[PDB]
């Protein structure tokens, strides 16, 4: 299989599991019946990234940026605007085709493009190449592999390295090598003195949640804990298991564990103890 999240997304958003006006101007509905376990292994991942970002929202008091790298067509940005959770800025990274793509449909879409040009500074966005750039949310093409690159352009789009920042990895690291990988999580250390990563993986062959731990522990990260994602299903709050239970029939065969048990939610913090960072949890 290869599956697009973002159309996932979608589906699951259209049956009713999480709250997301957005992801509908961004790409198409698929009309096909799923596995409803798999719509649950969804929401749990949307839900635990979400936890952990309100958190570290919360002990920053939003004076902090966000970078997405890999985001794709993530439609956090207009979430948190919603919500009133904005962070001081909130930067994606993707491949310049994907970013183009996305630039394509704000372009289109003035529920997209309205909010950005809200908080930004003039009442225009330039949307030349494969970047926008504006006051609170930029969008920029880069390849994640070309670290010196990738620093480039977001320094020039004005992330600033003095504020706490938050960087998350929402399957993506598994489209590059280990070496890649940990080449990205460790320039993430070292580029911040506050800091939290987040990495939302497939546990394949040979990976444990130990050696996820490991894996930002010995790439400059300074605390690290992990979760399977069936553990994270078993600890979402009993409301919200309820409100997502009862939006479809699941059969009796226990395979919504077969599923998330190959999934896991991984953290990590860097300095900030002062912030209560390593307090952090989903
Ligand atoms: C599996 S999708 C996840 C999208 C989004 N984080 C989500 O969970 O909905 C992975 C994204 O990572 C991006 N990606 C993979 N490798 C990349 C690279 N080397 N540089 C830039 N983006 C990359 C892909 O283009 C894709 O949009
Ligand atoms: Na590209």
């Given at each position: 299989?290869?599956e ?22 961004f ?5 096909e ?14 839900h ?6 309100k ?12 970078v ?22 909130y ?5 310049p ?12 879409k ?22 926008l ?42 489209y590059?090598t ?13 580029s911040?003195?506050?800091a ?8 394949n ?9 490991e ?6 990260w ?46 990590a913090?860097?300095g ?11």
């Open positions: 299989t290869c697009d999240a973002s159309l996932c997304k979608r589906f699951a958003v259209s049956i009713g599991y999480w709250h997301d006006p957005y992801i509908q101007h790409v198409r509905l698929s009309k019946r799923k596995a409803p376990e798999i719509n649950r292994g969804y929401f749990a991942r949307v635990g990234v979400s936890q952990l970002i958190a570290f929202l919360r002990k920053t008091e939003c004076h902090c940026q966000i997405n790298l890999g985001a794709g067509m993530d439609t956090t940005f207009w979430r948190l605007k919603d919500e009133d959770l904005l962070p001081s800025k930067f994606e990274v993707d491949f085709m994907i970013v183009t793509r996305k630039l394509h449909s704000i372009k289109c003035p529920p997209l493009s309205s909010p950005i040009l809200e908080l930004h500074s003039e009442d225009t966005l330039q949307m030349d190449g494969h970047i750039d504006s006051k609170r949310y930029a969008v920029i093409g880069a390849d994640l592999r070309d670290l010196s690159e990738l620093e480039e352009k977001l320094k020039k789009c004005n992330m600033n390295t003095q504020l706490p920042t938050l960087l998350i990895a929402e399957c993506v690291l598994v590059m280990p070496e890649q990988s940990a080449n990205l999580l460790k320039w993430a250390a070292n911040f003195e506050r939290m990563f987040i990495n939302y993986e497939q546990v062959e040979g990976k444990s949640l130990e050696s996820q731990k894996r930002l522990l010995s790439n400059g300074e605390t690290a804990s992990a979760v399977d994602m069936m553990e994270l299903y078993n600890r979402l709050p009993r409301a919200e298991v309820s409100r997502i239970e009862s939006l479809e029939f699941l059969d009796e065969m226990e395979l919504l564990e077969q599923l998330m048990r190959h999934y896991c939610l991984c953290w913090t860097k900030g103890n002062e912030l209560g960072l390593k307090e952090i949890t989903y």
